[PDB]
Amino acid sequence: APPLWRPGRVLARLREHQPGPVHIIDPFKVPVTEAVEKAAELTRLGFAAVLLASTDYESFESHMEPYVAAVKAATPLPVVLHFPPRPGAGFPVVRGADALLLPALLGSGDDYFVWKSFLETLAAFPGRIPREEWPELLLTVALTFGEDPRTGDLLGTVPVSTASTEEIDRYLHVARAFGFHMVYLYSRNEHVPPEVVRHFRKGLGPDQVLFVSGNVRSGRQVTEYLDSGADYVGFAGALEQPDWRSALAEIAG
Amino acid sequence: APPLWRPGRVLARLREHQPGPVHIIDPFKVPVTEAVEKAAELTRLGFAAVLLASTDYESFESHMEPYVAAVKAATPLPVVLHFPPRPGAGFPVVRGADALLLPALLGSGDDYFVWKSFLETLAAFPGRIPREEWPELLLTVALTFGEDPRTGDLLGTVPVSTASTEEIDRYLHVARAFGFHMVYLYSRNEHVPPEVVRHFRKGLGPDQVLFVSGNVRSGRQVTEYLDSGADYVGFAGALEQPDWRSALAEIAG
Numbered sequence A, B: 001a002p003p004l005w006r007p008g009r010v011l012a013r014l015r016e017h018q019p020g021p022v023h024i025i026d027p028f029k030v031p032v033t034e035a036v037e038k039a040a041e042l043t044r045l046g047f048a049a050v051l052l053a054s055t056d057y058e059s060f061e062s063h064m065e066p067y068v069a070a071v072k073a074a075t076p077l078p079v080v081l082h083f084p085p086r087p088g089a090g091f092p093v094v095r096g097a098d099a100l101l102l103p104a105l106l107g108s109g110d111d112y113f114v115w116k117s118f119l120e121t122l123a124a125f126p127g128r129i130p131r132e133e134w135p136e137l138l139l140t141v142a143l144t145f146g147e148d149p150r151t152g153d154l155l156g157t158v159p160v161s162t163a164s165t166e167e168i169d170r171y172l173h174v175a176r177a178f179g180f181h182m183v184y185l186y187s188r189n190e191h192v193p194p195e196v197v198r199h200f201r202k203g204l205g206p207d208q209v210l211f212v213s214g215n216v217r218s219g220r221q222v223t224e225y226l227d228s229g230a231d232y233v234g235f236a237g238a239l240e241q242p243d244w245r246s247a248l249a250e251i252a253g
């Protein structure tokens, strides 16, 4: 029996590594040869992990098993997957990934995305992957900020109110009582407010990891979120262009 | 495939059946011959289901498989199991049961009893039992009232505070958002307040089942709780004596 939903190597690394930026490679958009090039640079920069994530995906297993293997051959850093679940299957998984981030979308109006996806995933476990070879699971409270009809239509999310702390405080109480490992604050079309990142940092337990992402395109923004209490600041889109090496150097500067 | 965590036949019955008392047989205390006699009387009284439940258990499978079978042979009422989980094993289960009530102890200071027991149980599914023979799972918010060091020591529960409605309002937001099937309000040493039963009834969705139990020993108490909004009023101890037939007649009428 490997850790599974219990803390393991990846969560320990995220809890103990220096806070900093984390690049997120969308494997369904970025060709694998480019992911491999990027992976070598991420290794040199000392990021905590390499996240592979996308809102959309198809033929997950055939694409991702070798995509994860190619990335892992290019970096010693843990490779962590982050994708939404789908009713009838649960969260997608491939052997070789070091961990899966499992988002409980507490702001969703659909109880499957709030948490029943977790039940479907674990029911199906271990499935086709040998027990001992399964990735670790990082149980995460996932929250969305700002108008976002795309995530709303797919996962039932409603933007978290920042008009007061009423809603956010309910999510903090759940995050603590339920022993979630991480909280992920994301904005597809806007920016998670730094003041909200601070409120979460103040309200979470010392060992709960705080990730913030969405429209981060500069090193200044990374610093501001880290100064606000984020443990990690994710960014994908800034590097989905030809001049990614320059952008990556600036963001990591 | 089995409904498992999705609504099935037992939850449909509990949602639609006329509200009323439900006798709970402790299978580790009550001899199977007595449970079968009782089962025949519960059938004559039109109760919604037969619950088999205990705070304590050992050698669960070898004891319960035949016990459940003997009870199922004596009544057409669904047989529902309700027992606490144990780390390393999850909730106990045997084939033949129509359903397992899965208590998420939202007031526990131990996240395993708050809900990780669910993850361990589903990971272990299907285990030693064919998928098609598995019981249905009734996802339940379980709350404790009054001083109760026994449950506190075993499961980490803290009595719900009714000095304001803040704590129960948080549990109601979870029960609704998470799509729990039922709420179980229990008092080991006192009585759940009828006012609390009312507060839960008014705050739950119409399809969420509300069970109340603990020290119910009279028909008057059953009536008071039904009038307050409980869908079902559970009682075990009142029948754990020689003159149980008189006690049952009083409680049911």
Ligand SMILES: CC(C)=CCC/C(C)=C/CC/C(C)=C\CO[C@H](COP(=O)(O)O)C(=O)O
Residues within 6 Å of the ligand: A024, A053, A054, A055, A082, A083, A084, A103, A105, A142, A143, A144, A151, A184, A185, A186, A188, A213, A214, A215, A216, A234, A235, A236, A237, A238
């Ligand atoms: C809604 C939620 C938090 C979880 C459900 C699972 C889910 C939809 C996972 C996909 C990953 C995600 C949250 C957003 C996609 O891109 C951003 C980077 O944004 P940028 O290109 O602006 O840097 C990222 O990967 O973080």
Ligand SMILES: CC(C)=CCC/C(C)=C/CC/C(C)=C\CO[C@H](COP(=O)(O)O)C(=O)O
Residues within 6 Å of the ligand: B024, B053, B054, B055, B082, B083, B084, B085, B103, B105, B142, B143, B144, B151, B184, B185, B186, B213, B214, B215, B216, B234, B235, B236, B237, B238
């Ligand atoms: C703490 C909790 C709600 C769930 C965790 C699992 C758990 C401890 C399950 C066992 C069943 C239980 C909650 C209490 C035992 O007896 C009462 C009836 O009492 P009375 O003899 O006074 O009628 C009952 O079975 O309801």
Ligand SMILES: [Mg+2]
Residues within 6 Å of the ligand: A122, A123, A124, A125, A126, B122, B123, B124, B125, B126
């Ligand atoms: Mg399983």
